[PDB]
Amino acid sequence: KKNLGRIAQIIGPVLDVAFPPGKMPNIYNALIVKGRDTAGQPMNVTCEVQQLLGNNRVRAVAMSATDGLTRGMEVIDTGAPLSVPVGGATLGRIFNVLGEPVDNLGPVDTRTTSPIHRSAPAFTQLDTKLSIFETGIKVVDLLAPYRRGGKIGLFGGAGVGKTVLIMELINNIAKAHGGVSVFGGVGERTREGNDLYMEMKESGVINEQNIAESKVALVYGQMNEPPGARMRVGLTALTMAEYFRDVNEQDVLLFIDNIFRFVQAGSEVSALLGRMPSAVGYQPTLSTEMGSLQERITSTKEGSITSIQAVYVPADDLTDPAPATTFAHLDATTVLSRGLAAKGIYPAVDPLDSTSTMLQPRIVGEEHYEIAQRVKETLQRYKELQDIIAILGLDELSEEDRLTVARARKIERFLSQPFFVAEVFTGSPGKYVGLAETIRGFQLILSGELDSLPEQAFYLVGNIDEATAKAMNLEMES
Amino acid sequence: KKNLGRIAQIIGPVLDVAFPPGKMPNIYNALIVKGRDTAGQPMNVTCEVQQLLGNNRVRAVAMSATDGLTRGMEVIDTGAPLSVPVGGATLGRIFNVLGEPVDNLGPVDTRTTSPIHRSAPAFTQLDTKLSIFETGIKVVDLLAPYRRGGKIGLFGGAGVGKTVLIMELINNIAKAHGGVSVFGGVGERTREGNDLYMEMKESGVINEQNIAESKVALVYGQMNEPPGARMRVGLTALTMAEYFRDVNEQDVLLFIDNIFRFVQAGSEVSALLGRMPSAVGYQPTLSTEMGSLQERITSTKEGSITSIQAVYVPADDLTDPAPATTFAHLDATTVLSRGLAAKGIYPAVDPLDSTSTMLQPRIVGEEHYEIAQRVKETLQRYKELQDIIAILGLDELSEEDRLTVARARKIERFLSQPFFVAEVFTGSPGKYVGLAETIRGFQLILSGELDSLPEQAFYLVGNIDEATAKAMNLEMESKL
Amino acid sequence: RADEISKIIRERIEGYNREVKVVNTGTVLQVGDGIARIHGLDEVMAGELVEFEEGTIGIALNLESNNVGVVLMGDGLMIQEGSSVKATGRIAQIPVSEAYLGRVINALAKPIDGRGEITASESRLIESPAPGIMSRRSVYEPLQTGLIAIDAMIPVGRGQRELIIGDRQTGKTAVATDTILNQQGQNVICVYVAIGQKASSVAQVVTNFQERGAMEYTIVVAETADSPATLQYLAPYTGAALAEYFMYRERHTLIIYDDLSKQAQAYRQMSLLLRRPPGREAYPGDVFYLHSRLLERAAKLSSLLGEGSMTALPIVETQAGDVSAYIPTNVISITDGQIFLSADLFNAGIRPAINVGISVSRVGSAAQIKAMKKVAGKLKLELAQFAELEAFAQFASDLDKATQNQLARGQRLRELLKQPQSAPLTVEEQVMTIYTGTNGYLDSLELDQVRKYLVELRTYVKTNKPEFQEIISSTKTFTEEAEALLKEAIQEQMERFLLQ
Amino acid sequence: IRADEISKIIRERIEGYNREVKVVNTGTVLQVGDGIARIHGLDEVMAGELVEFEEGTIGIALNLESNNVG
Amino acid sequence: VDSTASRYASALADVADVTGTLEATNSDVEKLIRIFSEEPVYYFFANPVISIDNKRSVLDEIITTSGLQPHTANFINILIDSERINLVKEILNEFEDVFNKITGTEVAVVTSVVKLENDHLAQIAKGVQKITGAKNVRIKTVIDPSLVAGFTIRYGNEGSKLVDMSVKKQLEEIAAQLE
Ligand SMILES: Nc1ncnc2c1ncn2[C@@H]1O[C@H](COP(=O)(O)OP(=O)(O)OP(=O)(O)O)[C@@H](O)[C@H]1O
Ligand SMILES: Nc1ncnc2c1ncn2[C@@H]1O[C@H](COP(=O)(O)OP(=O)(O)OP(=O)(O)O)[C@@H](O)[C@H]1O
Ligand SMILES: CC(C)C[C@@H]1NC(=O)[C@H](C)N(C)C(=O)CNC(=O)/C(=C/c2ccccc2)N(C)C1=O
Ligand SMILES: Nc1ncnc2c1ncn2[C@@H]1O[C@H](COP(=O)(O)OP(=O)(O)O)[C@@H](O)[C@H]1O
Numbered sequence A: 001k002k003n004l005g006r007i008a009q010i011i012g013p014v015l016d017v018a019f020p021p022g023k024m025p026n027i028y029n030a031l032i033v034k035g036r037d038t039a040g041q042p043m044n045v046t047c048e049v050q051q052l053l054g055n056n057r058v059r060a061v062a063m064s065a066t067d068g069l070t071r072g073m074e075v076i077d078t079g080a081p082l083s084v085p086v087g088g089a090t091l092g093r094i095f096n097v098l099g100e101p102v103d104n105l106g107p108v109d110t111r112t113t114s115p116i117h118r119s120a121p122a123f124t125q126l127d128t129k130l131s132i133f134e135t136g137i138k139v140v141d142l143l144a145p146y147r148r149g150g151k152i153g154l155f156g157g158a159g160v161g162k163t164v165l166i167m168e169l170i171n172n173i174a175k176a177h178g179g180v181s182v183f184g185g186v187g188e189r190t191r192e193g194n195d196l197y198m199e200m201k202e203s204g205v206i207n208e209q210n211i212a213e214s215k216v217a218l219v220y221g222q223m224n225e226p227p228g229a230r231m232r233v234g235l236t237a238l239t240m241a242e243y244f245r246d247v248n249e250q251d252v253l254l255f256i257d258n259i260f261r262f263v264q265a266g267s268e269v270s271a272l273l274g275r276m277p278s279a280v281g282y283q284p285t286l287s288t289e290m291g292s293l294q295e296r297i298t299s300t301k302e303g304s305i306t307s308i309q310a311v312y313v314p315a316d317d318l319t320d321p322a323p324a325t326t327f328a329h330l331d332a333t334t335v336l337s338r339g340l341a342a343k344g345i346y347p348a349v350d351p352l353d354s355t356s357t358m359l360q361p362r363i364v365g366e367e368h369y370e371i372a373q374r375v376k377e378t379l380q381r382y383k384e385l386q387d388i389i390a391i392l393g394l395d396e397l398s399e400e401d402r403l404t405v406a407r408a409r410k411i412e413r414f415l416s417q418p419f420f421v422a423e424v425f426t427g428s429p430g431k432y433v434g435l436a437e438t439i440r441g442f443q444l445i446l447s448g449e450l451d452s453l454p455e456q457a458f459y460l461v462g463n464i465d466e467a468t469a470k471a472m473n474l475e476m477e478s
Numbered sequence B: 001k002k003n004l005g006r007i008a009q010i011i012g013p014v015l016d017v018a019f020p021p022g023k024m025p026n027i028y029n030a031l032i033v034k035g036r037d038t039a040g041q042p043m044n045v046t047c048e049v050q051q052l053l054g055n056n057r058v059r060a061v062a063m064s065a066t067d068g069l070t071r072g073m074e075v076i077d078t079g080a081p082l083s084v085p086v087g088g089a090t091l092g093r094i095f096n097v098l099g100e101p102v103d104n105l106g107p108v109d110t111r112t113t114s115p116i117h118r119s120a121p122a123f124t125q126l127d128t129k130l131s132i133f134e135t136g137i138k139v140v141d142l143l144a145p146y147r148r149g150g151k152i153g154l155f156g157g158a159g160v161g162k163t164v165l166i167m168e169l170i171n172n173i174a175k176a177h178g179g180v181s182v183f184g185g186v187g188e189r190t191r192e193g194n195d196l197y198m199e200m201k202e203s204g205v206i207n208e209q210n211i212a213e214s215k216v217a218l219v220y221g222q223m224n225e226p227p228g229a230r231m232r233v234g235l236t237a238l239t240m241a242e243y244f245r246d247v248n249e250q251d252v253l254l255f256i257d258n259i260f261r262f263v264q265a266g267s268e269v270s271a272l273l274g275r276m277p278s279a280v281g282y283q284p285t286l287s288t289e290m291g292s293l294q295e296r297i298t299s300t301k302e303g304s305i306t307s308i309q310a311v312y313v314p315a316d317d318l319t320d321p322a323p324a325t326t327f328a329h330l331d332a333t334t335v336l337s338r339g340l341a342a343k344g345i346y347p348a349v350d351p352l353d354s355t356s357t358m359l360q361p362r363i364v365g366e367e368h369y370e371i372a373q374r375v376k377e378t379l380q381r382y383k384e385l386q387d388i389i390a391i392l393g394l395d396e397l398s399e400e401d402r403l404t405v406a407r408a409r410k411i412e413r414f415l416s417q418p419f420f421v422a423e424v425f426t427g428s429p430g431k432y433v434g435l436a437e438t439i440r441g442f443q444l445i446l447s448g449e450l451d452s453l454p455e456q457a458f459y460l461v462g463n464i465d466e467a468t469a470k471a472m473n474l475e476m477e478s479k480l
Numbered sequence C: 001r002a003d004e005i006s007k008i009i010r011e012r013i014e015g016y017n018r019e020v021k022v023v024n025t026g027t028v029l030q031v032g033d034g035i036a037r038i039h040g041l042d043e044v045m046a047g048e049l050v051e052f053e054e055g056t057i058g059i060a061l062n063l064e065s066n067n068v069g070v071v072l073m074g075d076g077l078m079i080q081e082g083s084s085v086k087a088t089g090r091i092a093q094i095p096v097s098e099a100y101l102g103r104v105i106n107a108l109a110k111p112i113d114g115r116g117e118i119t120a121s122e123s124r125l126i127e128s129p130a131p132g133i134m135s136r137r138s139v140y141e142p143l144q145t146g147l148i149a150i151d152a153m154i155p156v157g158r159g160q161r162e163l164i165i166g167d168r169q170t171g172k173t174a175v176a177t178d179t180i181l182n183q184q185g186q187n188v189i190c191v192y193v194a195i196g197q198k199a200s201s202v203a204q205v206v207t208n209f210q211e212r213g214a215m216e217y218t219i220v221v222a223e224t225a226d227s228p229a230t231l232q233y234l235a236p237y238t239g240a241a242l243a244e245y246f247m248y249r250e251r252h253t254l255i256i257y258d259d260l261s262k263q264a265q266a267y268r269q270m271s272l273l274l275r276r277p278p279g280r281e282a283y284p285g286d287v288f289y290l291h292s293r294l295l296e297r298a299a300k301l302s303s304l305l306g307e308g309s310m311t312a313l314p315i316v317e318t319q320a321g322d323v324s325a326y327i328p329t330n331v332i333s334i335t336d337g338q339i340f341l342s343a344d345l346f347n348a349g350i351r352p353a354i355n356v357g358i359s360v361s362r363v364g365s366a367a368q369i370k371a372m373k374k375v376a377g378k379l380k381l382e383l384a385q386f387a388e389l390e391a392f393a394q395f396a397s398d399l400d401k402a403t404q405n406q407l408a409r410g411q412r413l414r415e416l417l418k419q420p421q422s423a424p425l426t427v428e429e430q431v432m433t434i435y436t437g438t439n440g441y442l443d444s445l446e447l448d449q450v451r452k453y454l455v456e457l458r459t460y461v462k463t464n465k466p467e468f469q470e471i472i473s474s475t476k477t478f479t480e481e482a483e484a485l486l487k488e489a490i491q492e493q494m495e496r497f498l499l500q
Numbered sequence D: 001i002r003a004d005e006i007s008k009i010i011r012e013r014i015e016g017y018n019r020e021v022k023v024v025n026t027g028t029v030l031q032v033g034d035g036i037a038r039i040h041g042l043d044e045v046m047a048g049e050l051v052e053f054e055e056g057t058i059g060i061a062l063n064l065e066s067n068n069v070g
Numbered sequence E: 001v002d003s004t005a006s007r008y009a010s011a012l013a014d015v016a017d018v019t020g021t022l023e024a025t026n027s028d029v030e031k032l033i034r035i036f037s038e039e040p041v042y043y044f045f046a047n048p049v050i051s052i053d054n055k056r057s058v059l060d061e062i063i064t065t066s067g068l069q070p071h072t073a074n075f076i077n078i079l080i081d082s083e084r085i086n087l088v089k090e091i092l093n094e095f096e097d098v099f100n101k102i103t104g105t106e107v108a109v110v111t112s113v114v115k116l117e118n119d120h121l122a123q124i125a126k127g128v129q130k131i132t133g134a135k136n137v138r139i140k141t142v143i144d145p146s147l148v149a150g151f152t153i154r155y156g157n158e159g160s161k162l163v164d165m166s167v168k169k170q171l172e173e174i175a176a177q178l179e
Helices: A138-143 A162-173 A190-202 A233-248 A259-273 A286-294 A321-329 A338-343 A366-391 A399-414 A435-447 A464-476 B138-143 B162-173 B190-202 B227-246 B260-273 B287-294 B321-329 B338-343 B366-392 B399-414 B435-447 B465-479 C002-015 C148-152 C172-185 C199-212 C229-248 C261-273 C287-295 C326-334 C343-347 C370-376 C379-392 C401-416 C427-438 C449-464 C467-474 C480-499 D009-015 E004-019 E022-036 E039-046 E052-066 E070-082 E085-103 E118-132 E168-175
Strands: A004-011 A014-018 A029-033 A046-052 A057-062 A075-081 A083-085 A113-115 A152-156 A180-186 A216-221 A252-256 A305-312 B005-011 B014-018 B030-033 B045-054 B057-062 B083-085 B113-115 B151-156 B180-186 B216-221 B252-257 B305-312 B332-336 B349-355 C023-032 C035-038 C049-051 C057-063 C068-072 C084-087 C093-095 C123-125 C163-166 C189-197 C218-224 C253-257 C315-317 C338-341 D029-033 D036-039 D050-052 D058-060 E105-112 E136-143 E151-154 E161-164
Touching: A014 A029, A057 A259, A083 A233, A113 A233, A138 A366, A138 A435, A152 A162, A152 A321, A162 A252, A162 A305, A180 A190, A180 A233, A180 A259, A190 A216, A216 A233, A233 A252, A233 A286, A233 A305, A259 A286, A259 A305, A259 A321, A286 A321, A286 C261, A305 A321, A366 A399, A366 A435, A366 C343, A399 A435, A435 A464, B014 B030, B014 B045, B014 B260, B045 B227, B045 B260, B057 B227, B057 B260, B083 B227, B113 B227, B138 B349, B138 B366, B138 B435, B151 B162, B151 B321, B162 B190, B162 B252, B162 B305, B162 B332, B180 B190, B180 B227, B190 B216, B216 B227, B227 B252, B227 B260, B227 B287, B227 B305, B260 B287, B260 B305, B260 B321, B260 C287, B287 B321, B305 B321, B332 B338, B338 B349, B338 C379, B349 B366, B366 B399, B366 B435, B399 B435, B465 C401, C068 C229, C093 C229, C123 C229, C148 C370, C148 C427, C163 C172, C163 C326, C172 C189, C172 C199, C172 C253, C172 C315, C172 C338, C189 C199, C189 C229, C189 C261, C199 C218, C218 C229, C229 C253, C229 C261, C229 C287, C261 C287, C287 C326, C315 C326, C338 C343, C370 C427, C379 C401, C401 C427, C401 C449, C427 C449, C427 C467, C427 C480, C449 C467, C449 C480, C467 C480, D009 E004, D009 E070, E004 E022, E004 E070, E004 E085, E022 E039, E022 E052, E022 E070, E022 E085, E039 E052, E039 E085, E052 E070, E070 E085, E085 E105, E105 E118, E118 E136, E118 E151
Parallel strands: A152 A305, A180 A216, A180 A252, A252 A305, B151 B305, B151 B332, B180 B216, B180 B252, B252 B305, C163 C315, C163 C338, C189 C218, C189 C253, E105 E136
Antiparallel strands: A004 A014, A004 A075, A014 A057, A029 A046, A029 A075, A046 A057, A046 C023, A083 A113, B005 B014, B005 C057, B014 B057, B030 B045, B045 B057, B045 D029, B083 B113, B332 B349, C023 C035, C023 C084, C023 E161, C035 C068, C049 C057, C049 C084, C057 C068, C093 C123, D029 D036, D050 D058, E105 E151, E151 E161
C-alpha cells in the first residue's frame, strides 16, 4: 500500500498535503492527486514533494493545473521520483513534462524508464577531448568556434534571432548528424513547436510510417504551461538524452529553447513556496538550480552530448542573474545584439562579445587563430573610434584610423550570411560556407586586396567569391 | 557578578542570554561567557549587552569568536562597561578590543583603568584655538592646511594611497610631536599593522630597550575579528587617548585606520540585533554612532587630541552614507581621486574637491591664501576646459587658454612628491618639503618663470630647485 | 590471507563492542533544500557537525531558542522527518597529510580522482585564527609568476594576498595556471580551489597540470555547480587549512581561489535559506567578514614559526567591468593589491591584459630582487605618466621632439609586455628585457620587430654567455659587471639583427 | 514569540483579571534598547506626551500600540 | 523557549508556585488537556465566528461542572479574552515542562526490548539523578522491540541527551570493518 494523504493548502501550484503521522514521502517524489474534473477522474494531476513542513505534512508543486482542487483530495505517493519513458520507444515522438505522448499516436512502452532526478556524472567519467566543429555560420566558425561535446549558448534579447539561429544550426547539423538528437522546448511558442514538428515530418526526419527510426525525440513544455511544468520539462528532455548517451553509447545533440524560461519558472515557483527572495526577484537557489541542470549535460567516456541552449537575456541586460550564471556554465557563448539586428547585419552576433574557449591554436590551427585575432583587433579599434565618429564623422580620422574603419565596415558586413531558414524573410537563398573559405576570405579582407570593392558587396553573401561577383554586378550597373 | 545567566540563542556574534528575574545586566555592560577550549579547559568569551529585549533576556554582541559556545552555558554580569587599562602601562604595547596585551610581553599594569563608554566633553570645555601645523607634503600644506588640535580626514577607495599617506604623516609628525601618539587600528590588515610595528621598532619610536619610555600605544582591530572588535577598538583607543589628554594634559596624535570599518561592523551587527535596515544597508543608528565616536574625540582646555583618521569610501562614491556622515565632523578633508592615483601623480589628493577650514586669510597669511586660490583657479579652469579640448583639439584655443592648460598640467605634476615610505613604490628618496619652498615654487610656476621647462621636470620633485635641476638633466639627456 | 586480516579485525571486535557516552541526539522538524531545522540538541556547539539517519553530515549554525538551524552537507532527500540525528563532538575537522600532493579532492577531502583514500593522520580545523601581528614578518621574498608585467611592475611576494580581478574570458584562470606552473623549480606547494565551476573545466585543468608536470606539488580542491551551497562555501576554507598545514611546517605555499564570487553566492544562498535578513542586494551583512576571515590567514610567518609562507591569489569576476559591485569592492579592500584584467586590452592585442593603471601591489620592491628593483623601480609611475602623455598627445597636432621620443619609447615598452599563453620568463630574461627596453635601445627598430628581436637577444645570451645568468642567480644583483656583459651582448645582437 | 507578553504581565493579569481596569496610574518598562523603550500600561497617555522614566530619563510617547507604548 | 505557549505556561506555573498550589493546578491541567482533546470543544473555543460571550458562557458552565482552580479558570478566561486560544493545546503541552523545571522532577525515558523491574528502574533513576542533579527522577516506560537486547535511556530538558546500547554496538562494529 502506498501511503495516502489529504490536501490542506492550495495556493496556485503550491499544494500542502497532510500525510499519515509515520510515513511521509521524500524530496522530489511523484505525488498523484486523485482529482475530480467535470465527468470522471482526472488522475493526471501530478505533483512533486519539494519540502517537509513538519507535523506530518509536506509541500508540493503541481506539474499541471490546480484550479478545481478542493481541500480533502486523496493523494497517493509513488515512492519513486518522476520517471519518464526512455530509449527507442521515444524516437520520433512528442512528449510532455510528464512523458505522456501528445503526439496523437499510440502509447509509449514503459519497459525502461528513467527518473528525472539523477546525480551528475563523476569526475573519472568525463573526458578532455578538445574537439572543433564547424557550423557554416561564418561568425560562429571564426570568432567563436563551437566545441563538440560541450554546451553552447545563444545569449540574446527578444526578437533578435536566437530561434532563427538555432534553427539554422539544426538544419546544418542535425540532418547529417550520425547520432540521435533530442529537442526540448522549455517554454517556447506552440506555434514554433508545430512548425518544427511539421518540418521534421515533411523533411522526413520523423518518419510518418515507421516511427521506429527517426533519430529525434521532442519534449515540449510551452509558455502556457504552469511553472511546475516549465521547471521540469528540461529535466525530462535531459533524462532522455542522457539515457541515449549512457546506455546506447551514442553522441547526442540537445537543442534547448530556452533555459531562461526554466529559470523564470523556478522563480515563480520559489515565490509561491515562500523562500526569501535572492537578487531582485530570483530564487535563492538559482546557482544550484542551474548547475543541477547543466552539469548533467557534459559529455562522458561513452557518449557525447553537444547541447546548444538558447538563453533569453531580460531587457537586453547581460547583468541579470540568470545570464550571469549561465555564462559561467556554457563552453562557448554567442552574444546577439539588438543593435546589429536593427542595422540589418544578420546574424546579429556581437563579434567581440561572443567568446569561445576553443579559439586556441592547439585546437584550431595557427592560421585560424591568427586571422581571428586580427579580426578581433580591427573590430576593437572600430569600437573605440565609434565614440569619435558618432559626433565628428569619418573625415576627422588619421590615415591609419580611416583605414581601420573602412576595413572594419567591410569586415562587419562580411560576417553577415544569409540563412536557409531565413529565406522566407530575406528572399535570398541561404549560403553554406565552411572554414576553408571563411579563413581565406577573411585573410583577403584584412590583407586589403579587396579594398577597391564597396561595402554592399560583402553584405549578405556566403563566399568571398560571391562577394566579388556582387561587386562586379555593382560595377555592371555603372 | 553573582547573577549568572544562561546562553539561549547564538546567531553568530549576536547572542541571547537569559538572567534571573530581577537581576539583569545593564546596557553596554560586559558579560563573560564561561566558554570551553577544545581541550576541555574554559575559553572565556567576552560580550557587551546591546539591547534588553524582555523576559529577562538581553542581546549581547560577542567581542570574540562565537564558535564552540553551546547553549545553556554560564554567563556572568561583570557590572561595568568594557574597561581598558590607561596611563603609562599602554606605551609601547599592542592591544586588543578588550585592552589585552598581544605583543607577547609582560602583562600591563591594570592599576589604572577607564571604562570605554563615557560621555563627550561639554560645550564650556572646548578649546577654540585655530592654528595650522607643517606636515611636509606640498599639496597638503598648501591647499588643505591641517588644523592643529582638530579632526582631519582621508577619503578614498582602496589602493589610492590613504594608508601610505597616513604613514607619511606619522613619519613627519610623530617624532616632532613632543607628546604621545596613539594609533587605533580599526578593520585593517594584519600585515599592515605588523609592518607599522616593525617600522616603529626600527625607527626607535617605541624604544624597546626601555618599555614605558615609548611615545606610542597600539590598538589593532584587524579584519579577521568578529564585528564586536571592529566596533569597539576605535572606542578603546579613544579611551586611552582621552586619558592621555585628560590627566596627562599633553597633545596627542590619534591616527585611525580604517574608520569606515567601525560603521561597517555596526551595519553588520544591526540587522541581526533586530533593527530594520535603513538605506543602502547601514544601521538606523548610524548618525548617532558616528556622533558617539567623533564628539567624544575633541580638543579641550586641558589636552588637545589631534586626530588624522582615514575614511574608506566604497567604490569611490562620496554619496555613500558613512563617508557622507564623517564629512560633517572632519575639519580638514582631503579626497583621493583614482584618476590622480592611476595617472601616476602621487599623493593622489584631488585638490579642488579637498577643502580645509583653515584656509582663511587671517589664519594662513594673505600670500598663502592668494596662492592657494590661484592654484585652485587654474586647476578648475583646466578641468572645465579639458573635455572641450578633448573633443575639439588643442590648437584652436587662445593664447591664455593654451597657456593656462600648460601651466595646469605642470602644476598637476608639481603637486606630486616622493614620499619617505613610498620608496619601495617609486624608487626615488622621499623629500620633506617646507611650506616656504612650496609657496615659492607655486608662485613661480603660476607667474610663468618656468614657462619653458619640461612638464616632466615637475614630476616627483620635492623643492623647485630640484625641478630646475631635473629640467637640466633632461635637457642634457636630450642633447646626448 | 583473508582469514588472518579478519582474525585481526575480530581481535579488534572483542575489544570494540560499545563505548559509553551521552550522545546528544534530536528530532528533525523541517527538511527543505539543504537546510533542516532540528528539535532537541541543546548541548551542541556552534558549527558542530551532526550526522543524520542517512549518514548526511550537517553543521549546526543557528542555535535558535526552540530549534537548531542545521545546514545539510549534501542532499535532504533520504532524511525523513522525525528521524533522529546525532551530534558528533567535532567542529569541521579535516584530515591532512602529504599524500594530498597530486590528488584532486572534494570539499570534504574526499578523492574524486578515485585513486584511493588519502593517508592522513593529523587533522587541522577548517576554521582557524589568522596569524597575529607578531606571528608574521614583512614580505621580502618574490613569488615569480613568469609574466614580465606582474613580475616587474606589480610584483607579488611570498606571503602576500593578490587579487586577480576581471571580466569573462580575460585570462584570469590562465594567469593563475601559469603562476602555478612557473613554480616547478622554486619548490612551493600549490593549491587550486575551484568553487562552482564546470566539471569539464576542472578536468581540463588537471589534465594540463598532469601532462605539464605540475601535479607533483599541487592539490585540487574542487566541487562543481551541482554541489551543495555549503560545500561551495567550505571549499576555500578547506583548501586554506590544507595549505596551512604545510605553511606551519616550514613550507612555502600558493593557493588560488578560482573563483571567490561563486563561494560568496553559495554563502548568500544558504544565508537566505536560513531566513537570515538580506542586506544590500540579497547578500548578508557578514560577507565581508566571510572573505576577510579566509584571506587574513595568508601570511609570511616569522623566524620563530619557521618562516613559513602562504601566498593567496584569489580570482573574482566583475560583470561588464563594474568594480563598484559589492563583492569586487570587498575583495579589493581585503587583498594586498589587485591585478585588473580588461577585455578591452584583451581584444586590442595586449595579452595578458594587465591594466596596470588600476592595478597595484602593496608590497612594492620588497616583492622583487635587487636586480629587478635596480632595473625597474620607477617603471610603473613612468609608464602611467607615459600612458597619459601618449593619451593626451592625440589632441596636439605637432609635438616637440623630447615628448615624441618619450612617446615612441613608451610604445616600445608597451610592445615589450606582451606575453603568450603558457610561457614563463625567468628572472634573467626579465631583467635583461626591462634593461634593453627602458635604456632606450629599442627606440630605433619598429614596434613589430621589437618582440622578435627580444626573442633573438635572449636566445643569444643563452647560447653565448652563461655568466650573466650565473651572476643574476648566485649574487642576485644587476651589478656593473653583469651590465657590462649585457651591453656587450645587446650590441652584438643588434648588429646581427641588422645584418640579417 | 510575541512582544508585550513577558510571562510576568500574564502573571499579573491572571491574578487581577476580574475585569479590565484602568492602569494609567502605572506603567512598566518591557523592552529597552538603542534609544527607545516599549512601555506597558499608560492607557490614557496622549500621543507626544512626555513620559518620565524612573531614574530621571524623560521620554515621549510617540506611537501608542495595542498594549505597549513605544 | 520563547514560544507564546511556553510564555503563558510559565506564567501560569509561576502563579501556581507563588500560591503553593502547584499540584492542584497540575491536576486541573491534566483535566484541561483531555477536555481540549475533543475536537468540537477546541474548535468552538478557537474559531472567531463564534461570539466571545457564548464562548465565555460555555466556559463558565465548564468551570462549574468540571471544577477548576480559581486562577486557572481566570486564565482560560484570559486566553479567550486575549486570543491565544489557538495555542491552548500548546500551552497545556508546555505547562508540563515548565512544571518539571520548577520542581526538579526531570522525566527520563527508558526504552528496552521488554519491560524491566523496579530494581533496574531505581538503578537508572539513581544514575539520572547523579548525572543531572535533578531533585526528583520520574521515569517513562515505553517498549521498543526494534532494539536487539539492551536498554536505552534519554533525558535532558528536552529528550536531547541519550545513551543507548542495543544496536549501536552492531553499527559501530560493522563500520570499523567497512571503513
Ligand atoms: N538570418 C536572418 N535574416 C533575417 N532576419 C532574421 C534572421 N535571423 C533573425 N531574424 C529576425 O529575427 C526575428 C525573430 O528572431 P528569432 O525568433 O529567431 O529570435 P527570438 O525572437 O529571440 O526567438 P524566441 O522569441 O523564440 O526566443 C525575426 O523578425 C527575423 O526578422
Ligand atoms: N597570456 C596569454 N596570451 C594569449 N592568450 C591568452 C593569455 N591568457 C589567456 N589567454 C586566452 O584567454 C582565453 C580565456 O582565458 P581564461 O579561461 O583564463 O579566462 P577566464 O577569466 O578563466 O574566463 P571565465 O570568466 O569563463 O572563467 C583563453 O582562450 C586563452 O587562449
Ligand atoms: C482567472 C484565472 C487566473 C483563474 C486562476 N487560474 C490560474 O491562474 C491558473 C490556471 N492556475 C495556476 C491555476 O490552476 C489556478 N491557480 C491560480 O493561479 C489562480 C489564480 C488567480 C488569482 C487571482 C484571481 C484569479 C485567479 N486561481 C485562483 C485560478 O483559478
Ligand atoms: N606617495 C606614493 N607614491 C607611490 N605610490 C603610492 C603612494 N601612496 C600610495 N601609493 C600606492 O598605493 C598602493 C597601496 O595603496 P594603499 O595606501 O594601501 O591604499 P589604502 O590607503 O586604501 O590602504 C601601494 O602599492 C602604492 O604603490
